[PDB]
Subunit: 289 residues, 4 copies
């Protein structure tokens, strides 16, 4: 029994889903951490069967989804939950969605797990460029997209079997300036890649757990489409399929099969690394055309 917690999903159009699918080929149970705001709306789509076709894992199998619970990366413990969300229309019919509350939840219901996934981000001012991003907008970006990874590791390590494995998703915007990826998402990802190394030493020396991050390429997910900058996301994909070393179309399951491998023991000697699953676009410099 392998339980993998995938924190960061909304539909079946993102990386978490592509991550979950590939893992199922290994028959790992899947628990989904969903942002409260789209939880029920997600749960609803689930109950009606909108994901049934999207769940038929290759190897003639259904995607064994252990559970799907509310989860919010910008809240550590139950007392960080302010009066606002306390009232916020949706949050009302939901509870125990703070990072530590889900850890306790999953650990009480199913116990120790051995694979953790951080597939979530958000930069409220992504549309403004760094130079025009506020302190609130930026720090919020880091809090949601960077620190969470740390917070998650702090509370979840406790319920993880020895030698578990953690992964996150990052963007090359962090190493080379890619115009239009603003509001702190560059700063954020830059830090998330650095903290990967630092956490890699702590988690590995003390608990002997590994942690790495995947630097994916363009993907038409709700977040990517929601960016808005014929859309930032549509421009990155066009460019990629045209200039990337590998001419084919990048699939979520592409990052999924890589995540699958990095979350296994077949990679026991790899940690604190940033693995590029971007068809090789990251190696290029000046485009031919």
């Amino acid at each position: 029994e392998d339980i993998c917690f995938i924190a960061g999903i909304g539909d079946t159009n993102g990386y978490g889903w592509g991550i979950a699918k590939e893992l199922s080929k290994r028959n790992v149970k899947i628990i989904f951490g969903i942002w409260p705001p789209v939880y029920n709306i997600f749960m609803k789509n689930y109950k009606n069967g909108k994901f049934d076709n999207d769940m038929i894992i290759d190897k003639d199998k259904k995607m064994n989804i252990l559970d799907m619970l509310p989860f919010d990366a910008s809240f550590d413990t139950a007392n960080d939950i302010d009066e606002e969300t306390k009232n916020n229309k949706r949050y009302n019919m939901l509870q125990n969605y703070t990072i530590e509350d889900v850890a306790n939840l999953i650990h009480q219901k199913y116990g120790k797990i051995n694979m953790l996934v951080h597939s979530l981000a958000n930069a409220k001012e992504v549309q403004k460029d760094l130079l025009n991003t506020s302190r609130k907008g930026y720090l919020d970006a880091l809090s949601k997209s960077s620190y969470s990874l740390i917070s998650l590791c702090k509370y979840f390590v406790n319920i993880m079997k020895p030698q578990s494995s953690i992964i996150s998703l990052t963007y090359h915007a962090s190493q080379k300036v890619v115009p239009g990826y603003g509001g702190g998402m560059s700063s954020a990802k830059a830090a998330l890649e650095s903290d990967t190394r630092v956490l890699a030493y702590h988690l590995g020396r003390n608990y002997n757990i590994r942690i790495n991050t995947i630097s994916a390429g363009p993907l038409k997910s709700r977040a990517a489409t929601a960016i808005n900058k014929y859309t930032f996301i549509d421009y990155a994909i066009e460019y990629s399929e045209k200039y990337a070393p590998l001419r084919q179309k990048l699939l979520s399951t592409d990052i999924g099969s890589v995540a699958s491998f990095l979350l296994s023991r077949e990679s026991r000697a790899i940690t604190g690394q940033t693995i590029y699953v971007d068809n090789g676009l990251n190696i290029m410099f000046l485009p031919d055309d």
Copy 2:
């Protein structure tokens, strides 16, 4: 008349001072941005003559200090100033110390300038390791040590002559895990090096201004001694003078002479770069001993 604003100084034991000295050899006027909490205490040391010896620039000259004004990197505009600092014992006898307020101040009193320096940092939980750092502690670190650089550029660009030059100071802790540099200072510096590139494109494309950051090595400054981790700082220096390619002792004026050059036109073609002034320690891998 070259006016350089150096934001981040407390005594004459840090990099800003080593920065200012080297610049004076070029007869550039110096304006000091000082943290309110140590402003007057700094001003006092200044009036008594505790810095007179520390100001005798090589080339038989005094260090022409245009001014020294209160400055706080964790406050952008005058309205971000909360009721706390509003009351805080010290702040009381000080005003116009928000990033935009000093910009306006310096611009009204002396006008356009052409060299900007970001020599300041602070991580309230530096003593805890990443995995044990809070959200407050971390984000505060980023706000003080990372976003400020951006905020500073946003407000100061306006009063800068065409083709000005900006620099900041960063630490290799950002690229390779160096135990004991916690509380977010690794995450912080990682982002400050990334945002350097992104700001490098904006500032350079739009205003034709350059920005780079210096990756210094160990220096026994109040901040370094204040870290506490025979002290983190004493261990880094011992190690460096023993294994670094260049066997000599690293001086603030070392980073100073490099800052001097990067803040000039003699480097007009360099931007968005992280220059290591660490005697080469950063090139090593495994130490001989």
Copy 3:
């Protein structure tokens, strides 16, 4: 069925062997390309069933060696073998061992294969430190460790089905200086990784073939003892096992299971990358002690 040519094995103590072992678990047909100097002696020990307990794959499997051929990566085509080597005591008996003749031989007896492994290096002056390496040895190191790959790629890409994968081994000493790794080796690995980028480009766009390189930690191989500097390899294994995030002995099969992943469809979205398999050593700057 997947066929893999491992150009490197010269006994079970290095990565060459480990890689082979692991590829077998996945049931791929191997084909060793042994170097003439050690070809006679290897077959010998193979017949005497010495490697028998070494061809032990946990899953009560027995390695599946398909063919075993003499192979010297110094020669591109049969016209490059000189007279002396042509008439050497160890070579006389053997034949068709050039990079072109083994490629045809392989394509003749089995057809197109779809996995190329490069696990070889040589540097006559590995002992002498860079400064005192001769132009002769230097060019010999690259010719042997660097070029050998490029030429394997040119000639072997014509017997490789689309989507087939290639890989090679490298050492961090190219990115970070490790005293003692001389004779032009650091230089050679610096080229192999850059070349891995350029090649991943041409091979991608043209043949839909991927190429990557694994940066392995230390393993006591025949070749590692050759390095004389408890020698160099024993200091490296000791330093590593005490300072890497993961404190477990780095097995050769660990690099093996990673070569296997790269060599398969699982990694179809990765090319031109230097993936570190080394228990995380590369992410460290300063030590714990």
Copy 4:
């Protein structure tokens, strides 16, 4: 007085010349090491006062060429010149042009100098793309562009006072693939930068001598047109001037004033570094358009 040997100048259109120009502003004595093929013709144009308007240093100065010697970096010592080149039409007249003989010659007529500039490269197959480069040309490229430095360093370090500085030129195509930069050049620059690290180590610890390398943007030099791919160099200059953060034509003197800084005490704390002087192109991933 500072003496600098610039091994590279073959006419005023490249970085070699620009570097020389700038070093003069600082009043350093230069010494050109011209290649035999172009030695006769260079002296010619020099006597005819053609470079006269080119030796124009803004400050109404007139360049200060000290000596001008034939120099071929292919040969380490006089025993390496072969018979044919020894008897070639362009070489017969000349003498003492090996890396060892020019070093003694320089030390004999002037004594120890304290600034070594390496501004040369060659690759017979720069035109052909990596995959189709021969072992011969490849080894020739490195022997010419890579090794040449290491050997200059060994022999010249004995006529260089402590704290003296060395530098060389490189191109980003080593870190990022730029189609068209072939014949083993990318590979060569990949070695030069790694070697810059190793050398900066041995030279530091031993001779207190620093060594760095400048990664310059595109400049239309004799050698850049040799590259046939508006050719390769004109596409590079055009792409650069339109996408680099700084949109100004990249002068050779800009790389020059940076070589001058590195070559002086100002940078006494920097070694083993690849400093980019290229208007910021290297920090870009995707383009604006």
